[PDB]
Design a protein around this ligand. Structure first.
Ligand SMILES: *[C@@H]1O[C@H](CO)[C@@H](O)[C@H](O)[C@H]1NC(C)=O
Lengths: 48, 165, 132, 189, 145, 191, 91, 49, 120, 51, 48, 49, 137
């Protein structure tokens, strides 16, 4: 489930903390490149 | 360290042929954590002097393998030795020459039992006797593990073979 | 063969790298571990630029038989497809083999007058430009 | 075979305590000429010896410059043994490093090479010099076989799988590639 | 066909800097993308130069009544000496948990095989998975066999 | 005078995604189109022993910003950054690809992903094996300048573009315009 | 392990360790009627309430452990059928 | 592996193996050099018929 | 496995390569190039002296100075060990390179792949 | 007239490892170091050829 | 493709040999030592 | 046979850790190096007229 | 005909205060091929200087300074049964050891190659640049 205090990963939390307070697209661009755009909520794991 | 009386007048010639491992009762790491992945293990017995040439077929990831071992005699008829950290003492105490076979193995001060049969199914009386013996051997019933009754390897290849001898 | 599963589970122990996402070496040097971080990083970037200019692999003599030049230290060896032997691969058992065009070395940059590079295909790109 | 005359005797050396001279090889056995058993090198006894690193430490007989942090550390850096001598009250850690085996084949990598004869010369690099460094690389040849009949356990080459890298070696970079190329050209005329 | 080389316009106006590592964020937009195997591009997208810090840098988060780890992942103190991956990042603190009572992990050995792949990030425009985001290796003390 | 021409080319590209057993089904395609039953069962057992977490539902990643220093401000800035990331290299910028090809953006370069049994520079050659209906589908254009926040609404106005429906294919599915509420600096940075 | 943290002595509620019912967790999940995929876990199927209640399946001597949330468990496995055949000929 | 035998052999003169700084090392070395030079040319197939 | 022609020997061949790996190929640099990279510091004079000595050694013991047949010069004996014919002592167009001429600076050669001009 | 010639050359190389030697701060063997110390500063073809 | 690899984005431990060689690197621009570093350790490192 | 002593060694034992089996041998100080290159090949030829 | 030739020696640089040495170098102009004469000499030169300039050679460290490698390892990694401070400079003078896994989990298969430097311009592997040591989840 999504809504909870989900224990974030060490690199994810570290990169989220290293983001500047003021709006800076530079760091957020690299963060979105490294981590992506979405995370999985639910669904099966069927192969292909 | 324990020692019991082997089979009276054990004949390796009449014991030769193809054997099928059915149940093994012991307390090992691979038996308790990876016991659910056990497969059909068959045995091949061939006399060689006083010792016993031993070949083992078993499916590993589908591909069969040939484990060739030589049970060295300990100087006493019935008992055998096998060498690889540890010393293996093979002791055959209760068996006939047509239907079943019970083997005893010792390693690092730990006892273990192995039930062998010529073909499936196994008689209920043989299984009851095996259970009685493994209970008399200070082993619990939960430490008993049953093996599949099909999927035995016919023969391996030259590339897939072991050279313990 | 039928032992493809054995090769597959053996690669599980000793695999080979295919795709790589690279990162420059001066970014690996952190300030918390080495003093003078800014100057070291600037010198490392300049050295990387000079190295890329040096080992661009275009300065080697063009090979034959559709060969691919490879730079290694001071020696240059031509990798040739199956069917050609000898140095530079001028001998082959084939006629009028199609030779793939290769790009030459890009020219030096202009002094802030509008940076443009020239290169002749004697299929590599060219006409690169950078604002001053 | 034609050999030139012996050159003039060079100056004597205090430590070498020997003389030296040589000549040049003019013409070897081309087709059927008489060969020359004599060589182009020679030596001579001398008795004109006169006087025979500056770093932290130095071996007694060999001029190997060694730092003091490698003295009395449980590893012989000099062939004479001047680094682990008189180390009475000195703790020597095992490093869990001398138990593992070095890379097989460092001897050939430490030998010289002659392009004229394609043969191996004497040792160039010190294949047994570690300099207190302990680098381990995952071995690739520890994959032969391993079986256990008592527990019916078939596993992989986990026993003794580590290769210590002998300071003089940058990296071993374990890798594997096998390219079998067959070139067959059948012609019939 | 007609090959198309990339051509980007001038970068966007300057932004502010408040990360104690002042660097003017100057992003640009590539108005014309490459096509037909042409030149991808030549110049870098981002450009960081000197900047004047105006806003103060944000201080670290308050770690109230929480055992701090080597990274900074502050969790409840009840997880100390639980005999498992308590912090889920590193075993730095470990609470010197020598005498681990209360049957740590209740002899539960194996987790799901590759739940980290499901917990990993996801990208939609590329169809390729990303790094782990949700640390599912943790347990919170509540063993669920 | 008698002349005969023989030319037969058959190529297969199996995709078996069982880590080690994945290569077996791919290698077995040489001269054997039908998959082996035993090999298929082995691959199924392998896939049972190793999950395939792909094909699952997604959620906005920026929502996971819950307890960090300046959490809400960072979450809003990540919202804006994700919007800019999505609209900076959207496939709308790339020109339409031939034979219904799908275009993507890798950095600053367009790539026309070709349908199976097709190839070429822009998916133009190898139309021998289509096995589809055909035509030219519709593609959404790049979003225009955003609304100036007159009353909070949006002014995306996604309309048709240079790839119109010509070969009878279906038009671009989705809304033509969008409507939302301007954040007003996200309620002046949360009250 | 909060209740069993520092128990000096414990009373054996079950004489032998029995295996749990397979796929017992599927009957504890919630059901979202609107989504067509029932839901994630809501009820716990590992809790037993201390009472070591069991049931013996056919030719499955090893007993299964019935959770406390299951009041009645019955093994009445029985198959329950569609058949389609089409044939066309033209000459 | 139990008992191998020579296949390829690099050559080296014996007079070069004489120990240095001996009593008459240099003169004996040159003398053995002359001796081997005369030996390899003394009797062989070249001198026979 | 050399006389063998089947893939059955490939497993044992790979096993032997695991136990005893041979050196297939390797890059090389002159012996005087490693003296510069020593901890002793500057050795320019000795390095140049050894470089001149190696340049003279590669000429006094060159493969051409040996008797023409692959010519292999080892010590003071000239051999080819065969010409694959096994007809005579040397196991007798053919082609043969002439030796490097004296330093003039010019340097001539005659008969043919390779270079024929060198300058000191 | 009949002539048939075939060269079925099959070369197979299996790379067991790829090693790289260091370039700086190389510790030479004690024998080579002694030989280097036994070389005079004046040009001498004999000692250098021996080395 | 057998396994997916990803290096940590920041706060990584450097090798001791590379540590010593960087400590030996000069401050003034000298292309010789930097070229030796490129030849000994490459031009980049592995992130993914 | 050997014309010189090949058993004496100078100082610290120089390891020769190589070979088919797991066994450690010594290299005498008289020999510079002894590699364990286990090469093996063969040749064939046919002639007719 | 295309024998290797290096450019002239670069101008002398100022004596480095920290490294107490001056440096000069040359770069390749034409690569050798066809068994030509290579550039068989050092592409750089080093000389000793007498520099009088304060340098910040040493770097500070909050945690314990390792005795052999000189690493800034925190005390939380000491006396844990792991080899962190280098070869054996860690685990020194430890009363008890803990925090180690019981099953003795091994390292990732093939992780050694993924920790070494790579030359993207030549596709060749190089020495190790990252510390993939053990340092347990
Ligand atoms: C479901 O459980 C009940 C319990 O009494 C049993 O009678 C029935 O056979 C089971 N199966 C069904 C309803 O399909």
């Amino acid at each position: 489930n999504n809504p909870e205090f989900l224990q974030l990963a060490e690199p994810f939390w570290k990169e989220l903390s290293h983001l500047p307070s003021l709006y800076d697209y530079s760091a957020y661009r690299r963060l979105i490149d490294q981590y992506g755009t979405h995370y999985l909520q639910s669904g099966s794991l069927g192969g292909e | 360290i324990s020692t019991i009386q082997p089979k009276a007048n054990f004949d390796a010639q009449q014991f030769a042929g193809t054997w099928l491992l059915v149940a093994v009762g012991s307390a090992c790491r691979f038996l308790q954590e990876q016991g659910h992945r056990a497969e059909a293990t068959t045995l091949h017995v061939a006399p060689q002097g006083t010792a016993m040439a031993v070949s083992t077929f078993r499916k590993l990831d589908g591909i069969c393998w040939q484990v060739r071992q030589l049970y060295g005699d300990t100087g006493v008829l019935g008992r055998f030795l096998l060498q690889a950290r540890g010393a293996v003492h093979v002791v055959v105490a209760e068996t006939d020459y047509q239907s079943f076979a019970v083997l005893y193995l010792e390693r690092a001060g730990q006892l273990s039992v192995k039930l062998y049969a010529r073909s499936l199914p196994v008689s209920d009386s043989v299984l009851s006797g095996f259970e009685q013996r493994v209970q008399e051997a200070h082993l619990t019933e939960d430490q008993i593990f049953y093996f599949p009754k099909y999927g035995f390897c016919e023969a391996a290849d030259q590339f897939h073979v072991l050279d313990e001898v | 063969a039928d032992l493809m599963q054995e090769w597959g589970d053996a690669v599980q122990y000793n695999p080979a790298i295919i795709k790589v996402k690279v990162e420059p070496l001066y970014e690996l040097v952190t300030a918390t571990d080495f003093a003078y971080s800014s100057t070291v990083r600037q010198n490392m970037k300049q050295a990387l630029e000079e190295f890329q200019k040096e080992v661009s692999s275009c300065h080697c003599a063009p090979c034959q038989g559709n060969g691919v030049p490879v730079l290694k230290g001071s020696r240059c060896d031509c990798i040739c497809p199956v069917g050609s032997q000898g140095l530079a691969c001028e001998v082959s058992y084939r006629k009028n083999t199609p030779i793939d065009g290769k790009w030459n070395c890009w020219s030096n940059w202009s002094s802030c007058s509008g940076r443009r590079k020239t290169r002749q295909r004697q299929s590599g790109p060219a006409s690169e430009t950078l604002d001053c | 075979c034609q050999l030139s005359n012996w050159s003039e005797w060079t100056d004597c050396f205090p430590c070498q305590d020997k003389k030296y001279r040589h000549r040049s090889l003019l013409q070897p056995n081309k087709f059927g000429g008489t060969i020359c058993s004599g060589d182009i090198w020679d030596q001579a006894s001398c008795s004109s010896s006169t006087t025979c690193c500056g770093q932290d430490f130095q071996c007694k007989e060999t001029g190997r410059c060694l730092k003091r942090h490698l003295v009395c550390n449980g590893d012989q850096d000099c062939l004479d043994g001047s680094d682990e001598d008189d180390c009475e009250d000195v703790r020597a850690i095992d490093e869990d490093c001398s138990q593992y085996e070095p890379i097989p084949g460092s001897q050939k990598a430490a030998l010289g090479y002659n392009i004229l004869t394609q043969e191996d010369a004497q040792s160039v690099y010190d294949a047994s010099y570690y300099g207190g460094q302990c680098e381990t690389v995952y071995n690739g040849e520890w994959r032969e076989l391993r079986y256990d009949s008592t527990c019916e356990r078939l596993y992989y080459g986990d026993d003794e799988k580590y290769f210590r890298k002998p300071y003089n070696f940058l990296k071993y970079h374990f890798e594997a590639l096998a390219d079998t190329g067959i070139s067959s050209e059948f012609y019939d005329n | 066909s007609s090959p198309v080389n990339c051509q980007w316009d001038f970068y966007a106006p300057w932004s502010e800097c408040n990360g104690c590592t002042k660097t003017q964020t100057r992003r640009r937009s590539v108005a014309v993308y490459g096509q037909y195997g042409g030149q991808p591009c030549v110049g870098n997208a981002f450009e960081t130069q000197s900047c004047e810090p105006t806003r103060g840098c944000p201080t670290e988060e308050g770690c109230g009544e929480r055992f701090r780890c080597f990274s900074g992942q502050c969790i409840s103190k009840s997880l100390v000496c639980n005999g498992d991956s308590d912090c889920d990042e590193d075993s730095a603190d470990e609470d010197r948990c020598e005498d681990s009572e209360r049957r740590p992990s209740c002899d539960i050995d194996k987790p799901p095989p590759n739940i980290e792949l499901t917990g990993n990030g996801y990208n939609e425009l590329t169809g390729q998975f990303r790094n782990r985001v949700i640390n599912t290796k943790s347990f919170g003390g509540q063993c669920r066999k | 005078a008698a002349s005969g021409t023989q030319n037969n080319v058959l190529r297969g590209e199996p995709f078996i995604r069982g880590a080690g057993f994945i290569s077996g089904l791919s290698y077995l395609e040489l001269d054997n189109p039908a998959g082996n039953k035993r090999r298929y069962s082995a691959w199924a057992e392998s896939v049972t022993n190793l999950p395939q977490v792909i094909k699952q539902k997604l959620t906005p990643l920026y929502e996971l910003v819950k307890e960090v220093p300046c959490a809400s401000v960072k979450k809003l800035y990540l919202k804006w950054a994700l919007e800019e990331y999505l609209d900076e290299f959207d496939p709308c910028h790339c020109r339409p690809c031939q034979n219904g090809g799908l275009a993507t953006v890798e950095g600053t370069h367009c790539l026309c992903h070709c349908k199976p049994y097709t190839f070429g520079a822009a998916c133009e050659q190898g139309v021998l094996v289509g096995n589809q209906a055909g035509g030219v589908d519709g593609g959404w254009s790049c979003w225009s300048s955003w609304s100036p926040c007159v009353q909070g609404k949006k002014t995306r106005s996604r309309e048709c573009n240079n790839p119109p429906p010509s070969g009878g294919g279906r038009s671009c599915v989705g809304e033509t315009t969008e409507s939302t509420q301007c954040e007003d600096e996200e309620l002046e940075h949360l009250r | 392990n909060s209740d069993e943290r520092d128990c000096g002595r414990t009373k054996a509620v079950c004489t032998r360790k029995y295996n749990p019912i397979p796929s017992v967790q599927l009957m504890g999940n919630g059901f979202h009627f609107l989504a067509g995929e029932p839901r994630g876990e809501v009820l716990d199927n590992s809790f037993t309430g201390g009472i070591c209640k069991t049931v013996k399946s056919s030719r499955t001597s090893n007993p299964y452990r019935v959770p406390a949330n299951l009041e009645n468990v019955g093994f009445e496995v029985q198959t329950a059928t569609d058949f389609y055949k089409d044939l066309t000929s033209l000459g | 592996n139990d008992a191998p035998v020579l296949i390829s052999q690099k050559l080296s003169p014996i007079y070069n193996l004489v120990p240095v700084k001996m009593k008459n090392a240099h003169l004996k070395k040159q003398n053995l050099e002359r001796a081997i030079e005369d030996y390899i040319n003394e009797f062989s197939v070249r001198k026979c018929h | 496995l050399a006389q063998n022609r089947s893939t059955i020997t490939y497993r044992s061949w790979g096993r032997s390569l695991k136990y005893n790996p041979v050196v297939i190929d390797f890059e090389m640099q002159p012996i005087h190039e490693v003296l510069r990279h020593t901890s002793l510091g500057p050795l320019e004079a000795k390095r140049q002296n050894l470089r001149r000595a190696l340049d003279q050694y590669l000429m006094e013991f060159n493969a051409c100075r040996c008797g023409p047949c692959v010519p292999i010069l080892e010590g003071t004996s000239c051999r080819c060990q065969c010409r694959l014919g096994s007809l005579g002592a040397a196991c007798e167009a053919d082609g043969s390179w002439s030796c490097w001429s004296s330093w003039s600076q010019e340097r001539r050669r005659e008969c043919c792949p390779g270079r024929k001009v060198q300058t000191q | 007239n009949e002539k048939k010639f075939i060269f079925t050359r099959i070369f197979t190389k299996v790379q067991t490892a790829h090693f790289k030697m260091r370039k700086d701060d190389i510790m030479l063997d004690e024998g080579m170091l002694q030989s280097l110390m036994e070389l005079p500063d004046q040009y001498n073809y004999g000692m250098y050829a021996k080395f | 493709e057998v396994a997916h690899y990803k290096l940590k984005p920041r706060s990584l431990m450097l090798h001791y040999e590379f540590l010593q060689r960087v400590k030996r690197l000069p401050l003034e621009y000298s292309y010789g030592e930097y070229r030796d570093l490129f030849r000994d350790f490459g031009t980049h490192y592995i992130t993914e | 046979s050997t014309p010189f002593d090949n058993e004496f060694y100078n100082g610290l034992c120089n390891r020769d850790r190589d070979g088919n089996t797991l066994t450690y041998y010594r290299r005498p100080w008289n020999v510079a190096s002894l590699i364990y290159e286990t090469k093996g090949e063969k040749n064939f030829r046919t002639e007719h007229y | 005909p295309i024998d290797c030739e290096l450019s002239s020696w670069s101008s002398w640089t100022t004596c480095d205060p920290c490294q107490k040495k001056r440096y000069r170098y040359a770069y390749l102009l034409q690569p050798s091929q066809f068994h030509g004469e290579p550039c068989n000499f050092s592409d750089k030169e080093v000389e000793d200087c007498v520099t009088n300039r304060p340098c910040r050679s040493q770097v500070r460290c909050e945690g314990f300074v390792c005795a052999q490698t000189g690493r800034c390892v925190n005390r939380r990694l000491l006396c844990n049964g792991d080899n962190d401070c280098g070869d054996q400079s860690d685990e020194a003078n430890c009363r008890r050891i803990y925090k180690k896994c019981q099953h003795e989990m091994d390292q990732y298969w093939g992780i050694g190659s993924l920790a070494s430097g790579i030359n993207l311009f030549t596709n060749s592997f190089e020495g190790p640049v990252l510390d993939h040591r053990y340092y347990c989840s």
